[PDB]
Design a protein around this nucleic acid. Sequence first.
RNA 1: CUAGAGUAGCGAAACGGAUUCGAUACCCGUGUAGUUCUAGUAGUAAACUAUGAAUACAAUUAUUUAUAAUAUAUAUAUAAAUAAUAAAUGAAAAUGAAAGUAUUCCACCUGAAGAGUACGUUAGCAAUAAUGAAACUCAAAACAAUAGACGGUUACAG
RNA 2: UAAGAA
Lengths: 215, 233, 101, 199, 125, 154, 53, 45
Amino acid sequence: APPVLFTVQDTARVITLNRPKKLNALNAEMSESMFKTLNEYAKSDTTNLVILKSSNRPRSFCAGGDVATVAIFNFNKEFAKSIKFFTDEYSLNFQIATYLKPIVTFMDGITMGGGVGLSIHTPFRIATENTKWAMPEMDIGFFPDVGSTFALPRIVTLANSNSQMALYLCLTGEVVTGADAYMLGLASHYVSSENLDALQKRLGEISPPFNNDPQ
Amino acid sequence: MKIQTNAVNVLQRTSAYLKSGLLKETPAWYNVVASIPPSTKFTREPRFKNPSNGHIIGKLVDVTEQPHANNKGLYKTRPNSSDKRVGVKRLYRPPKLTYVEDRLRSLFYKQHPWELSRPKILVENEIGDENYDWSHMLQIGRPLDGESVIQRTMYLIKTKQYGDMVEAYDHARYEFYALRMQEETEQQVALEEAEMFGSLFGVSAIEHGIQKEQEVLDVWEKKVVEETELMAA
Amino acid sequence: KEIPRYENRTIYGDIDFRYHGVKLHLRSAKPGFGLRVNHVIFEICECAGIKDLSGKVYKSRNDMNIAKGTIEAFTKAQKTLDEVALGRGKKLVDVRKVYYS
Amino acid sequence: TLAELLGRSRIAQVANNHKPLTYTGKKFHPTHQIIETKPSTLYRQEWGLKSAIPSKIKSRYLVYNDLDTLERITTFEPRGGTQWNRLRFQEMGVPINPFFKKFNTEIIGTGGLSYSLPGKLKNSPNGVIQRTVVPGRILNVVKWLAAIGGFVADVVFFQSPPSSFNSMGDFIRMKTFLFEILEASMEKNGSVSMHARLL
Amino acid sequence: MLYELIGLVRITNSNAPKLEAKELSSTIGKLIIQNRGVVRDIVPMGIRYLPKIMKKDQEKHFRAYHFLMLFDSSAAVQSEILRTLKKDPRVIRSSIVKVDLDKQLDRASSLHRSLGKKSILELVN
Amino acid sequence: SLVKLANTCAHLQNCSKVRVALTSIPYTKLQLQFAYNLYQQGFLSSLQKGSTMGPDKDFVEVTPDNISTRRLWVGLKYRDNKPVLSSCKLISKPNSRIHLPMEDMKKLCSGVTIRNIKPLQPGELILVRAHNNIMDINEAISKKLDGEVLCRVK
Amino acid sequence: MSQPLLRNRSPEESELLKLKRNYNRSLLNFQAHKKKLNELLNLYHVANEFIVT
Amino acid sequence: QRSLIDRIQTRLSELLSNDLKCDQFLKDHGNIKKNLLRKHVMMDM
RNA sequence: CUAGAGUAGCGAAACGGAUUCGAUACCCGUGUAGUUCUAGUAGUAAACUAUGAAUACAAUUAUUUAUAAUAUAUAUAUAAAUAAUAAAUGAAAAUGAAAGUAUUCCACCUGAAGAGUACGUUAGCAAUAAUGAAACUCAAAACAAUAGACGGUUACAG
RNA sequence: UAAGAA
Ligand SMILES: [Mg+2]
Ligand SMILES: [Mg+2]
Ligand SMILES: [Mg+2]
Ligand SMILES: [Mg+2]
Ligand SMILES: [Mg+2]
Ligand SMILES: [Mg+2]
Ligand SMILES: [Mg+2]
Ligand SMILES: [Mg+2]
Ligand SMILES: [Mg+2]
Ligand SMILES: [Mg+2]
């Protein structure tokens, strides 16, 4: 099946990451499809908001980027493919950050690397009891890649006057779970998993009251 | 009753009034309702799992998934007439909630009918405030009754200290008896010790029953005499 | 009530509406087309701002029932282009509106 | 989840039963769980059931079958009598062991009527109580039958009835007697058979 | 086919009332067995007063010896047996009812089946 | 089979009147193509394969062993207290099959009543069968393909 | 949409299916015969009490 | 008959479970692999 | 109705007695045909659910009814029927799983009256049954419901 | 490009 599924909920558009075995690891195919489809939705006048979720709902939302292929694209010296991969991923992150319609991310499960990039750049990011949030790039010889260095110095609530809690999270790669992520500001809302279905229906129903401007 | 339209669209009709000019002033609720839309679907929604016991609703087992002879020795080689009937109604019927404890609640009170005479309060205090460790039966904030026995039984089962529900239930029963005997001895000895120090009680339970029986029996005597006299005439 | 109107002159599509014994068949019309309808419907259209309309009444031609049923036809048996577009998640384009820019 | 809490809720703790609330046969033991309310909740018709109980009910005890019915009422009786029998038995002091070391539905030992163990003496300001004295009511001319503390018991005489018995006749139940409860066993049906003697 | 006959034989010989019923049973049984039949039971009911003063042919009865006979025979001979019963002065009332054998080859009479003994095998254990 | 398609149209209307979110239709190539055209056109919220008991959670492969117990499960859409799929009717009936050429199809899409068929409405979908492919009428016009005018859905 | 609607039953599946169906029929016939012989035997026990002569 | 059916099914399930020895048997006897495996198992007994 | 049997009761017709202004009626008495059986003819009824058959589908409740379980209890599941309904339909009364949503096939209707008449034909022992006109006349005629009036209409009170 | 009335 396609690695990303696109569906409709009466006004919202649902984007489901659809790679269960690899824990929704993000690719260049996935990033390109998401980027182009979000570009389409940005023009549609019948779209009000986008929901980002995963089919592998409990275990993972997005367990990082699929940087193993990036590492094989560099063992075989195919550096152009790694460049395309990161261009797609980071252009997608830039799109999500600057999107003019609401984007709602369901961080139900593991949320790491590319997952944080998908979820951290939206004002509406929902953690659950299953949210396992982390930024584990220091141990694979890589850097915070998805705009985390821009977001975390700004969104984190506690002990972040000079980005020092952001630095702690980035450098240590500590796994922040559930309501701790909500309390630190890594998530904007905290909703139980059992409710995310009903919420998804509600987000599909609400429309701007009049003059139909969802922006 | 027909699904009503005019209760959930008060905003739209009000806005038509306002745009036309039929209504001059915006109501106080207008912006509030505009910012908080009502739910206006009113659909029937299917369900695919029984909440209580975890049974899956809406799965058909295929003949390929029954490759072994049934209890009568016959293989299943084609669907039966039940499998061929659309079972969409089950998806919408509110499922019956089931708990093994209820089978075990019925047993206890069949074995102890006089435990039904112990009054029970169904008014909840706060279900969220309960923090019980069912490694023991007595709990602070709870009475000792059949539910203590059954919760202890379920605890013993989920920790696999017993494999069979019967043995766990019997163990809980004997702990319950141990606690009940202590309570009754406490009551009796407390009364005895109270009398030995000059506690003067008024009416006891026996005298209470005697006086109520007397109150009833006076009226009964009067009615009997009146009826006999009437019958004689 | 508020009556949906396409271009503030006609009804959006066609309407085949039964109100008790009255069968109304209303059809949207082009600009400049008049109100070619039953006289009761003509008066209602004059009050409602419908300018272009064709239609026919069958079975009962009781004036009161025609009058009452045409209003349910206008309010209940019409869906605007916006409602259809949002319900289906599709874009409904009016070809004549776009031909003239 | 909501289902687990419902399984643990107080309504769920009451075992299902549909035995008639107006039984006119023989009563050997309770059939219905007695439901109690505090004065504060009774003032607001609150009993922990679905629906508010009518204000006519001033008693704080009831028994019930169905929370709600097609008749839009709760099937209940404002009675908690069987608790007063049990307590009265506890006042008598006469004891009645399976309480000591697939499913069997038979009553186990005493069915919760009494947990008192057999051999113990009741100290009193006079001294050790040798025998238990209890008020009662002779019922009918027959071992006679006596209503004692909510239980029907067998009366045996020292030598013969006194003149009051045949003087009163069927009104013998109007006057209170004193009895010695000799013993109290329980039979297979669940019925307690106390043996007493008039004094 | 299994059939259950319930005859009401007359008892004119007061000193030995069973005398008639014995020879009735002998005649009917001889007919059955000589016509490729079988007799499974000859259960005797007792002497009993009839509900009314029943008049077979031109003689009135107030009591009779009741008897039951369970026998396996064909339809033609069963009709023949009924014919002989109906034109016999000794017999006051007669009735032959089928006992269906679609389930069990062995089946007890109506009396034993009512008592609880469904088949003759139970009745002999 | 036009009889089964008519049954499906009536069943969809029935399910929209009571506002059930999910229902089932017979499992056939025509039924699947029709449901897919409705789904792509925005009239259905979801289309799944399944059994007589419910939609399949995971892929279940269809064989003669289970063909009689297969169904197609469709999710119906509602918005603003109105069903998205209100009416669904056949044009080509079993007892009067209507095959049109591309020119008459263009006339029908342009407001002309052809063979007593009312023309296409502003928010309506007319489906056409060509070479055992169901498809939107405007798409058939674009592909210059004559065909059997099958059903309206509004 | 790409998946075939129906997949034909392979000759091996057909052979196993025919095996199972033949067994089902044979088993039902055999059980009928067994109960038949049992009922015959239970009549053969009580046949002592049947008059034939 | 019963023994043949039950043995065929048990052998089929076992081979489909541990998928190395089924490859061993496929190269010993010569998603289609499932049907061919069933063919070989059915001729096997 | 045709033959042949039977005919106790009931009972067209008929004959009488009443009642009545009158009785050609209701009521009473005798009572033939018929009602019964056998072999036929005939093929009509408010032959009615005033509702053709089949198929797919649509929200509930309560009863039974019949199976299948599970240990009287599961207020047990799956079917049919019945009752009250939602929606839908309908001129409404109301229908309600059809008078709803659909599909297929058949029968039938097209103002009242003349008229289910005449004529013809076919069939039948007959009675009749089927098929089934037109001229003439009129602006009528009918259905549901509404409010009254009335009833040799009910019940309750005063 | 389909109007009704007494
Ligand atoms: Mg004659
Ligand atoms: Mg006669
Ligand atoms: Mg007469
Ligand atoms: Mg008259
Ligand atoms: Mg006369
Ligand atoms: Mg004939
Ligand atoms: Mg006639
Ligand atoms: Mg007729
Ligand atoms: Mg009608
Ligand atoms: Mg005629």
